[PDB]
Every structure is written in C-alpha cells, then in structure tokens.
Design a protein around this motif. Structure first.
Motif, PDB file in Angstrom:
ATOM      1  N   UNK A  94       0.754  -1.382  -0.141  1.00 49.95           N
ATOM      2  CA  UNK A  94      -0.029  -0.024   0.018  1.00 49.95           C
ATOM      3  C   UNK A  94       0.838   1.468   0.047  1.00 49.95           C
ATOM      4  N   UNK A  95       0.754   2.000  -1.072  1.00 49.35           N
ATOM      5  CA  UNK A  95       1.459   3.327  -1.033  1.00 49.35           C
ATOM      6  C   UNK A  95       2.325   3.112  -1.981  1.00 49.35           C
ATOM      7  N   UNK A  96       3.333   2.308  -2.380  1.00 49.15           N
ATOM      8  CA  UNK A  96       4.042   1.923  -3.239  1.00 49.15           C
ATOM      9  C   UNK A  96       3.642   2.464  -4.630  1.00 49.15           C
ATOM     10  N   UNK A  97       4.606   3.434  -5.419  1.00 50.30           N
ATOM     11  CA  UNK A  97       4.095   4.020  -6.589  1.00 50.30           C
ATOM     12  C   UNK A  97       5.005   3.081  -7.937  1.00 50.30           C
ATOM     13  N   UNK A  98       4.011   2.493  -8.742  1.00 56.04           N
ATOM     14  CA  UNK A  98       4.360   1.622  -9.628  1.00 56.04           C
ATOM     15  C   UNK A  98       4.315   2.330 -11.137  1.00 56.04           C
TER      16      UNK A  98
END
Length: 68
Positions: free
Chosen positions: A28-32
C-alpha cells in the motif's frame, strides 16, 4: 499526438504483495511506473526492480498531479 518524457504513475491502495499467479507484489502506497498499459483494466509496470502485472482497481492513476 505528442508525448512527454514524463510518464504516468499509479499508487497502491492496499496490500497487493500477496500471492498471485504471475503478478506484481506491492505494498500500500508504493508507486508503480506504468511501463506498458495493456488495457484499461490492467497495468504492466515495475517496482524496486520487480516486473509484474496488476489491476487498475487495486491502484490509482491519481499519482502525479494534485488538485487544489
């Protein structure tokens, strides 16, 4: 018509680093970074040197711009 060096991005809404068949694991939060947009239902990108496929409902394309 014209493209821009800067590309789109997506943000995780919940824990997607679970166990999926040939998919991408992200927290959750990680930007791909959207590397290849197969369709308006899935997104093929890479995170922390990890290439995989993830849905569009699990992440948000709001990444980048910010409304006042």
């Amino acid at each position: 018509g014209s493209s821009g060096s800067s590309g789109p991005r997506a943000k995780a809404l919940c824990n997607y680093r679970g166990k999926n068949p040939g998919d991408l694991k992200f927290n959750k939060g990680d930007v791909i970074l959207l590397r290849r947009q197969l369709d308006e239902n899935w997104y093929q990108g890479e995170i922390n040197g990890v290439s995989g496929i993830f849905p569009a409902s699990s992440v948000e394309v709001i990444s980048g711009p910010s409304s006042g």
